[PDB]
Design an enzyme around this catalytic site. Sequence first.
Site, PDB file in Angstrom:
ATOM      1  N   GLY B  17      38.680  51.185  30.163  1.00  9.95           N
ATOM      2  CA  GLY B  17      39.697  50.144  30.282  1.00  9.95           C
ATOM      3  C   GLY B  17      40.149  49.668  31.654  1.00  9.95           C
ATOM      4  N   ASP B  68      31.544  48.598  25.158  1.00 10.64           N
ATOM      5  CA  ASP B  68      32.338  47.690  24.346  1.00 10.64           C
ATOM      6  C   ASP B  68      32.690  48.470  23.085  1.00 10.64           C
ATOM      7  OD1 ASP B  68      33.269  45.781  22.426  1.00 10.64           O
ATOM      8  OD2 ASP B  68      31.839  44.262  23.110  1.00 10.64           O
ATOM      9  N   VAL B  69      33.974  48.799  22.924  1.00 11.89           N
ATOM     10  CA  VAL B  69      34.388  49.696  21.865  1.00 11.89           C
ATOM     11  C   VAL B  69      34.325  49.083  20.467  1.00 11.89           C
ATOM     12  CG1 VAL B  69      35.906  50.854  23.505  1.00 11.89           C
ATOM     13  CG2 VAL B  69      36.910  49.256  21.854  1.00 11.89           C
ATOM     14  N   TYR B 159      55.210  41.318  20.120  1.00 12.10           N
ATOM     15  CA  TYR B 159      54.391  42.505  19.902  1.00 12.10           C
ATOM     16  C   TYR B 159      53.778  42.498  18.513  1.00 12.10           C
ATOM     17  CZ  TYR B 159      52.647  46.924  21.700  1.00 12.10           C
ATOM     18  OH  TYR B 159      51.823  47.899  22.190  1.00 12.10           O
ATOM     19  N   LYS B 166      49.889  50.322  17.114  1.00 13.37           N
ATOM     20  CA  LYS B 166      50.303  51.474  17.900  1.00 13.37           C
ATOM     21  C   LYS B 166      50.965  52.604  17.082  1.00 13.37           C
ATOM     22  CE  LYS B 166      48.924  50.173  22.154  1.00 13.37           C
ATOM     23  NZ  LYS B 166      47.782  50.756  22.883  1.00 13.37           N
ATOM     24  N   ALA B 199      51.521  37.992  38.649  1.00 10.26           N
ATOM     25  CA  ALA B 199      52.621  37.399  39.446  1.00 10.26           C
ATOM     26  C   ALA B 199      53.486  36.490  38.564  1.00 10.26           C
ATOM     27  CB  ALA B 199      52.058  36.610  40.645  1.00 10.26           C
TER      28      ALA B 199
END
Lengths: 260, 262
Positions: B17, B68-69, B159, B166, B199
Site C-alpha cells: 500500500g 494487485d490484491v 464514510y 472496516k 494540500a
Amino acid sequence: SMRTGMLMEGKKGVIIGVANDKSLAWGIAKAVCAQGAEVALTYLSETFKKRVDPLAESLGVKLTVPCDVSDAESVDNMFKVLAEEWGSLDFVVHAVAFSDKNELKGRYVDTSLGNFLTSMHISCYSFTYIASKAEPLMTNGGSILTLSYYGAEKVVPHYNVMGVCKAALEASVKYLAVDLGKQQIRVNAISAGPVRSDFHYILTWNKYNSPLRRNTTLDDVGGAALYLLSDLGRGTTGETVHVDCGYHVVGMKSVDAPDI
Amino acid sequence: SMRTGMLMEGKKGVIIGVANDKSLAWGIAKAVCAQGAEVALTYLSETFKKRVDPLAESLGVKLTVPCDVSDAESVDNMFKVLAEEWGSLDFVVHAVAFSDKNELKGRYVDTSLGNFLTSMHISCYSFTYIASKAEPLMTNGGSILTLSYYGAEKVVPHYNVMGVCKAALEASVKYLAVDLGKQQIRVNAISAGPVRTLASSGISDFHYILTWNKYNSPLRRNTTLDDVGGAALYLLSDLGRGTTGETVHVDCGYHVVGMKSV
C-alpha cells in the site's frame, strides 16, 4: 392462533425468513400477530409456497408474497405488492442469513472469496437494500429489525465468516439509523442466543454458562421484537439488544460449569 | 533514509500500500526501516513501478514486487517471490482499501450492490487471503497488521460503506488471531485518526473531519505519520509479542470524545 393483547394493533409489517415453526422469524411473527399486528410473510419462490401456507394460516396471515433477498427485482416487486395492498408500512423484520456449511466446519483463514461475497450479500447487504425500498413506504415512521449473534463481537468456534458478516450487519444498523432517523424510522438488531453436533455443543455451553442458566427461547426473542417494533421502542435506534439469557456478560467459563 | 535504532534488526517483511510519501503505509515503512527492518514494498502494476522506485530507494528497500490484491494470481506470485528471496517472513502490513468515491458523498442507505461487494473484497477479504498466504512463511511466528478507522465503531461523515467494511475487517482480525496464534503469529489493527495527505482534497467533509479531530481530540492535534509508525513498531517488533486480536486507537484520543472539547 389466539390473539392475547393489542400492543401492535393497527400496525402493518412484513416478516422475511419464516420457513418453519422453529425459527427466530416464526417466534417474532407469533409474538406480533398475538398482539394484533397485520403481517405479510414472504416465501422464496412458488416452488416453496406450500411450505409457508399452513404457517400463515395458523398465524392468521392473509398476505404472502414471494421474495428472494439476493434478487433486486424480487425485492422491488415485493414492496410494490405491499404498496398496492396497504399503501404504507409500519415495520420490517429481516431474518435471513446464508453461508457455506462446509467452510463453517473449517478455519476462518481458509474462507474462499465466493463464499465471503455470497455470505456478505445475503447476510448483510440485503438488509441495506431492503431498508432502501421500505423507506418510501414508511412515511409515518416505523421500525426495521434484523437479527445478529454474539459471534459478531467475540470469536465463537465455527461461526467463521458469519461472525464477520454479522459484525458488518451490526455496523450497517448504525449507519442506517442515521439515514432513516430523519423519517422517524428506527433501525435495530436483536443479538439472540442459540435456541433449542456442533449446534448441540454451542447450545449446551450457553445453558451451562449463561447467567439465567437456560437457553434463549422463541418467546424471549418475540418479546424483544415487540419492544423494538411497537410504540414501546420509539426512543431506541441503532442498537443491538442482547437476548441471550445474559451470555454476553460472561468473560470465562463458569468455574463450576463442566468443560465439554 | 538514516537508520536510528535496532528494534527491527533481522526482521523481514512486506508492506502493501505505499504509493507516495504522505500515506500511513509510508509512515510505517519509514519507521520499521529506520529500526533495521528488511522491507519489500509492493506496487499495484507495471504502470506504477516508476512511482515506487524513488520511495524504495530513499528507504533503502532493495525488493519491490507487483501486487494487485483483487487478483489472486498477483498475490500468489508476490508470496512466491518472497519465499524465493527470503524463505520466511516476520511481518506483513496491509494498508489497502477501496470504495466508490461518488457513493461516499451520498447516503449509506443508497449503497449499490456492486460497490458493496467490491469494497468488501478489497478492503476486508484481501486481508484474510493475504494472511492465508503468509501463514506457511511464518511457521516461526511474527506479526500481521492492518489499518482501520473509528468509522468502524461509530458513524462518521463521508464514510458510508467503508464503515461497514472496516467493522468486518476488525472482526476478521479476531478470527484470524485465533487461527494463526498457535504458530505465534499475532494479528492486529491500528485504528488511525485522520491525517492530511493532500494540500487540498477539495472535499468540504474531509476538511471538516480533520478540523473536528484536531480541535476536539484530547491532545488537540491531528494524528501524524510518526504516531502511526510508532504504534506499528510496537505491534510488529518483539515489544508486541503479547498483544493479538486487538485494534489499537492511534488517534490522539479522539475515540473517547462523547460530544466536544470544552
